[PDB]
Amino acid sequence: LQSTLDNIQSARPFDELTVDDLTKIKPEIDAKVEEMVKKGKWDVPGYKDRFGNLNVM
Amino acid sequence: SAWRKAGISYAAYLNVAAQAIRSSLKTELQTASVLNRSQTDAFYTQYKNGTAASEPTPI
Amino acid sequence: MQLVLAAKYIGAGISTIGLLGAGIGIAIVFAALINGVSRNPSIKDTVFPMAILGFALSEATGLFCLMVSFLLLF
Amino acid sequence: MQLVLAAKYIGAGISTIGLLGAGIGIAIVFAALINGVSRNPSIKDTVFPMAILGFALSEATGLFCLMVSFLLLF
Amino acid sequence: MQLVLAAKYIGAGISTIGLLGAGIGIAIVFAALINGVSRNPSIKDTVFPMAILGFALSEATGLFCLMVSFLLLFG
Amino acid sequence: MQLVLAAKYIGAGISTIGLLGAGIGIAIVFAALINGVSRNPSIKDTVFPMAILGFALSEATGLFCLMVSFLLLF
Amino acid sequence: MQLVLAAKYIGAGISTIGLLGAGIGIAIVFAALINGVSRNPSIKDTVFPMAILGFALSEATGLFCLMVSFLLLF
Amino acid sequence: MQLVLAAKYIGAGISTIGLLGAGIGIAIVFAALINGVSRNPSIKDTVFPMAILGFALSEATGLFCLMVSFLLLF
Amino acid sequence: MQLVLAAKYIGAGISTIGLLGAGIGIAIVFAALINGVSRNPSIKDTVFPMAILGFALSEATGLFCLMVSFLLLF
Amino acid sequence: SSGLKLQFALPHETLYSGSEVTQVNLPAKSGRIGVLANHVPTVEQLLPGVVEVMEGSNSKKFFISGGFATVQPDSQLCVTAIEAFPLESFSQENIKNLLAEAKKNVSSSDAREAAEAAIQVEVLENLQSVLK
Amino acid sequence: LTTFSLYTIIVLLVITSLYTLTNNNNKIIGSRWLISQEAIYDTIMNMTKGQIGGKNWGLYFPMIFTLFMFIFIANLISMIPYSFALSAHLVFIISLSIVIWLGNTILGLYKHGWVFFSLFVPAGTPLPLVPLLVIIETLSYFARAISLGLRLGSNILAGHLLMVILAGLTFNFMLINLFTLVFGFVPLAMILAIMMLEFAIGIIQGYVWAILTASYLKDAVYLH
Amino acid sequence: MLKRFPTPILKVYWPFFVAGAAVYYGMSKAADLSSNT
Amino acid sequence: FYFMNQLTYGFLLMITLLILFSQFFLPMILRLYVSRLFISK
């Protein structure tokens, strides 16, 4: 956990993280995405709780 | 009339509407009950930790 | 050119139907103005200028047809 | 001047229809006036000149249509 | 060509009717705005551009009718 | 090529007569929108979209009238 | 034959007058929908679908008018 | 025969205007439907069929007008 | 002969426009009926006969217009 | 139920409670409602005006000081009033006129009080109308 | 390659550049154009949830999205002075409306079969009024089949024709007249106004198309 | 950067595609008939 | 008429555009949504 905090101190791409890097790091998110795509349920439960919509509607 | 924006609320409107008749009452109708209603001795004394308790202004 | 002037006069006669909109427009504008000032006298000072402007725009729309008919008269 | 005068008469008849809109204007202005004065008698004193000006302006359009019809007749 | 120009004038004169709808529309918008601002004065800042846009669209329809009349006249 | 063009222009006018309904329609839609946001300020974000929907639909009806006129013009 | 096509165009023009009723109808439908959402915002989800249905019916009347005009033309 | 078919087309064009009031009628019935439902959600089940019947045959009146236009054509 | 039939068809067309009033009227009848039954659910049984009677009379007026148009045609 | 029952209450002494009554005028903000019997449930804000109550005896006038004209499907007319107008013994021209003219000068004193003085003079003028 | 072919290939190139070329390296920041695309996606997805939602909105969201973007890119290239309204035939919108209505009817006849005929009788309307109701609703659906095309196509063509006629009739704007003051510049003001009107109308009618096809899909899948 | 994700294109969107095919076939059939040229 | 140049071609166009959209662009928005959800949770 010292290694974790030391990495997080200066290796935290908050505004410059690559989505391809995120996919390569964790294949679990890829597996989830293809599973839910092939299932047809495009909803991602719990997605408007923290992210706004600015909906003109 | 304008007892909400220019005025205050329905309570004071109705109270003053009744008080207009209460003050403009005949001596025969002027009894102890209407005299008690006419008298107003409640002073608005807000709380200290709630509204700083500035002064005991009239209600 | 007899039929030309004849139908020009006919078009001028029918071009005045646009004044109907100006008439019912001032109608409804002033009706709502009276209702609003009946709601509360305070809003008069802020609601009267827009009622006047709305009547002006309605009469301008009517004057559009009036001018077109005048073009179909002279 | 057979066809020309005929079309002048037809155009005047068609122009005569602006009075319907003028009447609706005056009528709904007076209707809102009545509703407002019944709702609050005090507001009547202020609204009455507003109604006078409103119906005068509404009748101005009817007068314009009447003049347009008149110039088509003489 | 007398009949063609005659019917051009007739068509333009009857096409001018759209200003009836234009005036009725702008004034409906103005009447609603008057009622709304009288009912509540605070909402005026948020309801004024709404009525301005409505009036603009109604007078735009009126201008469409007027331009139809103009193109029937001169075109 | 005389009577056909004449009646073409006449029918174009009789088709452009219909934009009155579209104008009064977008008007009444915006009018109820104003009244609704007046009764409750907080419903604006919900009543705006279907209101501009109704405006678009009425304008499209007016442009149907305009299209009927235009095929009788070009 | 020329008069036949002329009256075809005239009837097509007259067929479009009924569309203004469809426009004002869809408009008053959406106006009442605005008022209802104002009174009961929570009933919007239940109320919008048959609001679309009413728009569809009035636009269908307008489209019967439009198709009558179209078949009168071609 | 030219004039017969020409006036058949003219009468068909004038006849199809019946959809104007059919649309206005379905819209007015629907507008009161929306107002009542938003003012009283519990009346939905017992108001819906009657309103459906109402605007359905109100549009059927316009369908009768369309049938008159069709027989004028065919 | 052919002119008589032509004006017969045009009269049928200008008689078909009588149904607009029937449509708008049955609209207002069913609109007030819906509003009333939405106000108090206990009044529907009492108000249904009168509402349907007034509707039937409005449809009878519309049928009178249609019958005049038909006796024109046939 | 047969007829109508009216529940007229006043803070000093309640007047009526479940008594058979015919048409009663209930001046609201818009106008008075002459409820004969039964009637749809309603809720209307009462305005200072004449409340005329018919029974089998006579037609007595009761200038109301306000309240609500609320009804129930069981035909319960509970008018929660404050002060009534017993017959005509409450009538007095001079005090009402002098109070009106004396509250006219303070009709523009301080915001809420200024606005309410106008309403007080209005109900005094209503008293003048009821004076007969 | 005709004019329509080059217009469509240019539209495809620009629309794909707006997404795959906007991402310089596809960061997680979600830049202003990226956030605009995100907002559009969220708006279309909540059309889907609000108007066809309840069991299978997500399945039908993608066609709503794709039709919205196609109509958006078509309406965006409508106001440029040279911009031609996709060969100026507009029958493409009619074809889209017809094919969408046919697909909705096929879906209704597949998921409901003969029950689709019961949609003509929502709540009441007993046997004496059943034929009238079914005729009225069938004619309403037939009108719906042409509603979408004779709508966006009609408005686009009317806007283009207004553009052309306006530009033609003011050819003497400052050519030879002496009265070319601001009174003669008023036609420029109306041209500017119709620019703004055409833009707003195109956007709001793309929204109209999206909500209408959503409502049609809901009526197809859900019987009421 | 860009990858292919297999969303259902035919399992769910078959009616629209078959309607488009039918419309194209009808247009091709009526090209020599509904043209009057 | 001149119909066999834009209608069937337009159908091929919206088919390929729908395919490209649904298979490429919507997955990017979905991926960013789920990534924000994951690193937010």
CB neighbours of K95 closer than 8 A, spacing ≥ 6?
A: K149, L23, M7, M10, M11
Burial of K141 (0-12, 13-18, 19+ CB in 10 A): buried
Q: Do the two chains K and E touch, given a threshold of 8 Å on CB pairs and at least 3 pairs? A: yes
CB F10, CB E7: distance < 8 Å: yes
Between the alpha carbon of residue L9 and those of residues H24, K70, M25, the distances in Å are 42, 18, 15
Between the alpha carbon of residue E13 and those of residues C11, C18, D63, E9, the distances in Å are 4, 10, 20, 6
Q: How far apart are CA K79 and CA K85, in angstroms?
A: 9
**DSSP secondary structure string, chain E?**
-HHHHHHHHHHHHHHTTHHHHHHHHHHHHHHHHHHHHHH-STTHHHHHHHHHHHHHHHHHHHHHHHHHHHHHHH-
Strands (E), D1-74: none
Burial of M31 (0-12, 13-18, 19+ CB in 10 A): buried
Give backbone dihedrals phi and psi of F62, rounded to 5 degrees, phi first. Answer: -60, -40
- For residue A1, the one-letter residue type is L
| Whole-number CA gyration radius for chain M | 18
Nearest to G48 by CA among K60, I30, F51, I36: F51
- For residue B52, the one-letter residue type is A
Strand partners, J5: J20, J76
Give backbone dihedrals phi and psi of K136, rounded to 5 degrees, phi first. Answer: -65, -45
Helix (H, G, I), strand (E, B) or coil at J5: strand
What is the torsion angle, in degrees rounded to the nearest 10, for the CA atoms of residue L27, residue L28, residue L29 and residue L34?
A: 60
Distance from CA of E13 to the nearest CA of C (A): 4
Q: How far apart are CA K153 and CA K151, in angstroms?
A: 5
- For residue D36, the one-letter residue type is G
Q: Give the count of beta carbons closer than 10 Å to the beta carbon of residue F33.
A: 31
Give residue for tokens 């139907």.
C17
Q: Given an 8 Å threshold on Cβ–Cβ distance, is M32 in contact with K28? A: yes
Q: How far apart are CA K107 and CA K31, in angstroms?
A: 39
Burial of J111 (0-12, 13-18, 19+ CB in 10 A): exposed
- Tokens of residue I13, six digits: 């067309």
Q: Do the two chains H and G touch, given a threshold of 8 Å on CB pairs and at least 3 pairs? A: yes
Q: How far apart are CA K86 and CA K4, in angstroms?
A: 6
Q: How far apart are CA G25 and CA H27, in angstroms?
A: 5
What is the torsion angle, in degrees rounded to the nearest 10, for the CA atoms of residue J56, residue J62, residue J67 and residue J71?
A: 10
Residue from the list K154, K205, K211 with its beta carbon closest to the beta carbon of F67: K154
J 70-129: CB under 8 A from I: 73
Experimental determination technique? cryo-EM
- The angle formed by the CA atoms of residues E2, E5 and E7, to the nearest 5 degrees, is 105
Strand partners, K27: A18
Q: How far apart are CA E33 and CA E35, in angstroms?
A: 5
Q: How far apart are CA J4 and CA I57, in angstroms?
A: 36
Residues of H in contact with I16 (CB under 8 A): 11, 14-15, 17-18, 65, 68-69
Helices K57-76, K3-16: axis angle to 10 degrees equals 120
Residues of M in contact with L13 (CB under 8 A): 18
What is the torsion angle, in degrees rounded to the nearest 10, for the CA atoms of residue D11, residue D16, residue D22 and residue D24?
A: -110
CB K33, CB M34: distance < 8 Å: no
| Signed CA dihedral, A34, A40, A41, A42: sign only | positive
CB M20, CB K15: distance < 8 Å: no
One-letter-per-residue 3-state SS of A13-24: CCCCCEHHHHHH
CB K188, CB K136: distance < 8 Å: no
Q: Given an 8 Å threshold on Cβ–Cβ distance, is H60 in contact with K139? A: no
J79: enclosing H helix or E strand = strand J76-80
Q: How far apart are CA K95 and CA K152, in angstroms?
A: 12
Q: Given an 8 Å threshold on Cβ–Cβ distance, is M37 in contact with A23? A: no
Q: Do the two chains J and H touch, given a threshold of 8 Å on CB pairs and at least 3 pairs? A: no
**DSSP secondary structure string, C17-70?**
GGHHHHHHHHHHHHHHHHHHHHH-GGGHHHHHHHHHHHHHHHHHHHHHHHHHHH
Strands (E), chain G: none
CB F66, CB K211: distance < 8 Å: no
- For residue I31, the one-letter residue type is A
Distance from CA of G48 to the nearest CA of F (A): 9
CB K103, CB K221: distance < 8 Å: no
**Alpha helix (H) residue ranges in chain J:** 93-105, 111-131
What per-residue string of b and e applies to J74-95 under the rule 16 or more CB within 10 Å gives b?
ebebbbebbbbbeeeebbbeee
